[PDB]
Every structure is written in C-alpha cells, then in structure tokens.
Amino acid sequence: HHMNTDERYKLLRSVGEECIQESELRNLIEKKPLIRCYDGFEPSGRMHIAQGIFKAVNVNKCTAAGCEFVFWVADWFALMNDKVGGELEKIRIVGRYLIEVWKAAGMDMDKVLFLWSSEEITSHADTYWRMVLDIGRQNTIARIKKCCTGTLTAAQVLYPLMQCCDIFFLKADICQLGLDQRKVNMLAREYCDLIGRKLKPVILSHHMLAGLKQGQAKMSKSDPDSAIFMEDTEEDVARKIRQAYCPRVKQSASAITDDGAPVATDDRNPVLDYFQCVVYARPGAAATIDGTTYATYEDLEQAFVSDEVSEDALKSCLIDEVNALLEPVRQHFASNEEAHELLEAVKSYRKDGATALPAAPAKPHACMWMPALLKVPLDVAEGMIKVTKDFIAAHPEGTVTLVLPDWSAVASDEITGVEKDISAALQVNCALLKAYGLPSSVKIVTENEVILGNCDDFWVSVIGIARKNLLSHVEELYGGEVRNAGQVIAALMRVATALMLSVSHVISTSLDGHINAFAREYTKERIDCVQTLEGRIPALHRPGGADDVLYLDDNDMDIRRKIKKAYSAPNEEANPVISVAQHLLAQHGALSIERGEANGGNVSYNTPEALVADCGSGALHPADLKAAVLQLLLDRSAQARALLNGELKKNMTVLRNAEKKMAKK
C-alpha cells in the first residue's frame, strides 16, 4: 500500500504532541529517502506500558512513513559503578531483554537499529568527546542549567552536553523523544546555528502517558500501580485499571510547557489517555463496548461523557484491550527458552534494592599546566622554571610533568576557542619555555595524549568527580562565576588528569588561579599545592595583555622597543628598570655596566643595596643602566629568538592570525 507525501506526513506528524517545524518535517518527507528518527534510553528492567507498547506504536509509525529508527542505548553509564566489567554486562542483558520485549510487543524491526553507547562512544572517542566539550564551550551555564530538573545540581550539567551531542553524533534528522526531553532538543537546534550545519533537527515530541491514580501527571517509580508494567499478570492489569482515576470530562490538550514535563490536573483521565495512546493510536484499532464499536477515540469519549458507556464498562474494555497487548509478550517469555532465561536473569538483579579512591604514587610526582595564552609573560615563565628546578632538587627521585591542555583550554574558550589555534599557542610557548631554561627532566605531555591513551577510564572519573561535587562548588574555583559551561568541565578534567598521571603535587601559576586547588580538595588534602614564584619582572610603565610587559615570544626588535619605553627618572631608587636589573643581578651574581672612562667608568654590582645607591643618589644614569640590561635580555633570549624565525616560523603565522581575529571582536 503506497502512501503519498500527504499521507506520510499525517502518519509521521501524528507521533508528536508537538512538532517543532511542521514545515521542516514536510520538507524532509518530500526530499529525503531514509530519515533518521532517534530516541534513547538507559536500561532499567521494569518496563512500563508507555515504553513497552506506546513506543512500539510510534516507532512503527515512523518506519511505515519511510523512516529509519535508531535507538541510542545509553549503556556506557554502566562503567560508572563497575568492578571488572560487572555492572556493564548486566545492563547489556537488561538491554537485550527490553529489545526482545519490543519484538514480541510488535515493533517492526526491519528499519530499526540499536546502537550501544559503550561501543560507539569509545570507538569514536575524539569525534564524540570534542563535540561534547564544544557544545559546552559555546554555552552559558544558565542555558545548560535550563536543560536539567534551588541549586542542588551536581555535574548534571554534563549529561545534557552528551545528550545533545548524540543527536549530531548519530546524524539524527528527527528527535523523536518524549516531551519531557524538550529542552535538550531545543539546545540541539540552537547548537545547529553555531556549527553551521544548515538543517536543524526536527523535534517530534511524543505524549507523556498519564498516571493511573489521581494527581499523577506521569508514571511514578515509587508507586508500582501508577502504571501498567509489562510483567503484570492479567489479574494485576485488572486490579490497576479498576482502581484507576476516571473523571467524566471531555479531554483537551494541555498547554505546552517550555519545561518539557507534564502537569497533574483533576480533569485528566488516564483511562481515556490510555485509549488514545495504546488503542486508537494504533493504525486501525477501535474499542467495542456492549455490541457497539467506536471508530474514533472521540466517539468513545462522547459515549462515556453522555453515559452511554459506564465507567465499569470503559475500564472493563481497557482491561481486556491492554491484556490483549501484553499477552503476546507473556506468551513469548513462557514458550521461548532463550527469552525466558533473559527475563530470569533480569529478575535476579532485583535482589539488591532498598567507588574506591585511586592509589597514591610511590614516589613524588609534580604536575603543571602550560598557560593557554597567546603571549605568556616572562615573569610567569621564570616562575615555572624555578619551581621545576626547586621540585627536582627537593625530591631528586621524583618526576615533573608539564601538561599542555589542548582539550581543557578549548572547552574553556581560551584564546579564539579553535583547536588549531590553542594547539599552536601551547606548542609554541612550550618550545620557548624550554629555550628560556626549562629542565629537560620535565615530561611534556598533551591532554590529547593522556586522554586518548586511557580514554574510557578518563571520562568515567571526570563524571565520577562530577557526581561527588555540587555545581556551585566548582564555580567557587572561578570566583563564584563561570563564563561558559566548558569552564566547569575543564576544572573536572584537571583533577581527572592529576589522578590518572598519579600525581603527588600540583604546581599552580597566577594564571591557573584556584582551579588546581580542586585536586587538593577532592583527594582529601592528599595532593599538596605548590604555588609558583612571581612578581619579580614587573610591568614597564610608571606606577599608578598590553604592550609594556615582557613576553617569551618577543623577538630582538620587540625587546629593543619595550625597554626604550620603560619608565625611569634620574636620581630615583625605585622604578621598573631597577627591579629588572636587581633580578638579573640576583640570577647572575653580578651586573656589569660598561661606560666611557670619565663618563663614570666601568662598574659592577653584586648587591641590590649597592645598585640603588648609585641610582637614587649617584652617577648611574638611567640611560647607562638600560643599555646594560637590554644586552643581557638579548643574550639570555638568543636560543629562544632563534626558534621564532626558524622552527616555529610556521606556527607563528597561525598565532598572529589568531591575534587579529581577537582584536576584531
């Protein structure tokens, strides 16, 4: 039986209580041969009629309209509580059990597919997780808080980033999920305008079946007779519907809450709602009471409100009708040996009703994060070098790891927020940091390497940490506020990195802020915090990322300029030029200024008191000092500037291009 475009649209559209862009659906039906419809679930085991039958009804509607239906089985979350693949294998069995019930329940599987998050995520780690982070990177945390159900949220701002990603991961054309999941699907449509993909996913949201008792807008997990379950006997079915709330009132559609979920009112009739969803929503079904048959749902609704049909009869009718729908399942799990076993295995898990901390490191291990900056201050770089040398000496059998945060920083929206730009920045500034004297003992590892190296475990701990900490708690690390949701993730990742690298100490710079203190907090004061030593090379303007502070990517021409504009009045014993000299003096052990004889003559200083004497009250002219310092900076940066014009010249093109994009906006 061939269906024209109009008939296909009617059938498909009839799945949704709402359809975000009927025009977009219509256009999809006209243009596209295999439309991806998508839905998803975590296996629970106790399957209720809305999930058992109603889903089957709607899926069958999509596949008849010429769609393909991909179910996203969210089993990856079993890796959370896992002890040697234990919980995962159970959840996959529950998973297979649900599928078998659907088969028996009458879902046409010819164009239906089941994907398992555990298989598909881990197999496509990069593609998957980078998007998850990108959706977070480009979204205010307020916008993502809206997607979850005062502030008790605790990294439940992560699951929506994942759920949203799934839609694009699977290339879903239609998001055929419940109306309760409306808000995430919206966020999908929004994210579509961010990633340039031209066609937004059509949100075809199905009806939330009502609870059987009064004051229930939805099925309840506390109340096992709030809805019919698939394992319920025909005696159970009779009992539950007989006691069910049943107002004699003509049912009208509820107002569309932007918060997807339904609301419980007194004139909401679940006996009638069932007839509409599990009976009349089937292709050519109709109810029969006392000889007469009602072709429309409306016909039955009238006959009930006119009192042509009794509440006794109406329920008796549903009871037989619902039992008719379950019997094929009941029969199948009796006859079929393999199916019966599936159920018996699922049943056995029910007798448990009503994670360990990672091992410390044997020997010291320091960790440090390269700042995700276009231009890194020399003051900060020298602080990092000293803290490394100070750690390696103080713990000579220990190790130091510098982590280039090429995943974290893109999540945080540092620099331009582009992978290539942040990779280049981290790669360039790292090479230069080594050119200024970073020890060779330091292990340089990227997050890309660390995360992919042991990917499954990594994200488990990111979430595991996420579950144990409140959202507001993580926002305290950024001073009470985050710029986007990605900053929340970046925080979690750093602790996750610390733990996987098995680190004893976390080195923080002034740029890292309180973010690294999280690792200390989470490990119960086990990981010690070492702070960097800064405030030695100051800004070159007079007292009162600009262009009066020395960066570690300054070339020979840049250094000459910045020194030239440095503030220094004559007969002065405290100014930027003095502070830099005393630092160079201290590091070196002497500061030799060269002069014409009778211009003062040549002189050295090996103490700060001696130098300040000749400046404030003496013959050390400002100009003489600055000519001495400028040479010393050029000499100490000879190795680094050689890299700028040679090895890093390729990447320096990418950074100056990034810099101009930032100045534009």
Residues that bind ligand FSE (CB under 6 A): 39-42, 72, 74, 163, 166, 177-178, 180-181
CB-closest chain residue to ligand FSE: 178
Minimum CB distance to ligand FSE smaller for 175 or for 317: 175
Q: What is the smallest separation between the CB atom of 104 and ligand FSE, expressed in angstroms?
A: 21
Q: How many other C-beta atoms lie within 10 A of the C-beta of residue 3?
A: 14
Half-sphere exposure of 509 (CA within 13 A, CB side): 24
User: What is the spatial distance between Cα 12 and Cα 180, in angstroms, rounded to a whole number?
Assistant: 19
Kindly state the helix (H) or strand (E) to which residue 490 belongs, with its residue range: helix 486-500
User: What is the spatial distance between Cα 413 and Cα 134, in angstroms, rounded to a whole number?
Assistant: 9
Q: How many other C-beta atoms lie within 10 A of the C-beta of residue 517?
A: 17
Q: What is the smallest separation between the CB atom of 255 and ligand FSE, expressed in angstroms?
A: 19
Q: What is the smallest separation between the CB atom of 96 and ligand FSE, expressed in angstroms?
A: 17
Minimum CB distance to ligand FSE smaller for 156 or for 651: 156
Question: Residue 114 carries which DSSP code?
Answer: E
Cα R_g (the chain), whole angstroms: 34
The two beta strands, 112-116 and 67-73, are parallel
Minimum CB distance to ligand FSE smaller for 261 or for 517: 261
Minimum CB distance to ligand FSE smaller for 96 or for 494: 96
Minimum CB distance to ligand FSE smaller for 22 or for 180: 180
User: What is the spatial distance between Cα 166 and Cα 188, in angstroms, rounded to a whole number?
Assistant: 10
User: What is the spatial distance between Cα 82 and Cα 162, in angstroms, rounded to a whole number?
Assistant: 20
Q: What is the smallest separation between the CB atom of 630 and ligand FSE, expressed in angstroms?
A: 60
Q: What is the smallest separation between the CB atom of 36 and ligand FSE, expressed in angstroms?
A: 13
User: What is the spatial distance between Cα 446 and Cα 409, in angstroms, rounded to a whole number?
Assistant: 11
Q: What is the smallest separation between the CB atom of 55 and ligand FSE, expressed in angstroms?
A: 8
* DSSP reduced 3-state for 605: strand
Q: Is the dihedral of CA 84, 44, 161, 412 positive or negative?
A: negative
Minimum CB distance to ligand FSE smaller for 56 or for 177: 177
User: What is the spatial distance between Cα 101 and Cα 88, in angstroms, rounded to a whole number?
Assistant: 20
Minimum CB distance to ligand FSE smaller for 74 or for 202: 74
């500037």: which residue's tokens? 641
Nearest CA-CA partner of 40 in 110, 115, 149, 133: 115
Tokens of 510: 């002034």
Q: What is the smallest separation between the CB atom of 450 and ligand FSE, expressed in angstroms?
A: 26
Minimum CB distance to ligand FSE smaller for 178 or for 383: 178
The residues near 296 (Cβ < 8 Å, ≥ 6 apart) are 280, 286
In this structure, are residues 204 and 15 in contact, taking their beta carbons and an 8 Å threshold? yes
Which string of DSSP letters, residue by residue, matches 53-104? IIHHHHHHHHHHTTEEEEEEE--GGGGGS-SSSHHHHHHHHHHHHHHHHHHH
For residue 467, which amino acid is it?
Answer: R
Q: Give the CA angle between residues 347, 349, 355 to the nearest 5°.
A: 165
Q: What is the smallest separation between the CB atom of 361 and ligand FSE, expressed in angstroms?
A: 36
Minimum CB distance to ligand FSE smaller for 178 or for 486: 178
Nearest CA-CA partner of 277 in 243, 229, 217, 322: 322
């298989």: which residue's tokens? 119
Distances (CA, A) of 374 to 146, 479, 550, 664: 33, 23, 13, 15
Minimum CB distance to ligand FSE smaller for 40 or for 364: 40
Q: What is the smallest separation between the CB atom of 169 and ligand FSE, expressed in angstroms?
A: 8
Minimum CB distance to ligand FSE smaller for 178 or for 405: 178
User: What is the spatial distance between Cα 417 and Cα 412, in angstroms, rounded to a whole number?
Assistant: 8
Minimum CB distance to ligand FSE smaller for 39 or for 231: 39
Q: What is the smallest separation between the CB atom of 296 and ligand FSE, expressed in angstroms?
A: 27
Q: What is the smallest separation between the CB atom of 489 and ligand FSE, expressed in angstroms?
A: 18
Q: What is the smallest separation between the CB atom of 219 and ligand FSE, expressed in angstroms?
A: 11
Q: What is the smallest separation between the CB atom of 39 and ligand FSE, expressed in angstroms?
A: 5
In this structure, are residues 140 and 484 in contact, taking their beta carbons and an 8 Å threshold? yes
For residue 201, which amino acid is it?
Answer: P
Minimum CB distance to ligand FSE smaller for 39 or for 447: 39
Question: Residue 537 carries which DSSP code?
Answer: S
In this structure, are residues 349 and 487 in contact, taking their beta carbons and an 8 Å threshold? no
Minimum CB distance to ligand FSE smaller for 179 or for 400: 179
In this structure, are residues 569 and 615 in contact, taking their beta carbons and an 8 Å threshold? no
User: What is the spatial distance between Cα 582 and Cα 6, in angstroms, rounded to a whole number?
Assistant: 83
Q: What is the smallest separation between the CB atom of 43 and ligand FSE, expressed in angstroms?
A: 9
Q: What is the smallest separation between the CB atom of 190 and ligand FSE, expressed in angstroms?
A: 16
Q: What is the smallest separation between the CB atom of 461 and ligand FSE, expressed in angstroms?
A: 20
End-to-end CA distance of the chain: 58
Q: How many other C-beta atoms lie within 10 A of the C-beta of residue 207?
A: 21
Residue 513, Ramachandran bin (φ over 0: left; ψ between -120 and 50: alpha; else beta): left
The two beta strands, 591-593 and 603-605, are antiparallel
Q: What is the smallest separation between the CB atom of 186 and ligand FSE, expressed in angstroms?
A: 14
Minimum CB distance to ligand FSE smaller for 175 or for 370: 175
Minimum CB distance to ligand FSE smaller for 40 or for 576: 40
Minimum CB distance to ligand FSE smaller for 139 or for 181: 181
User: What is the spatial distance between Cα 510 and Cα 494, in angstroms, rounded to a whole number?
Assistant: 16
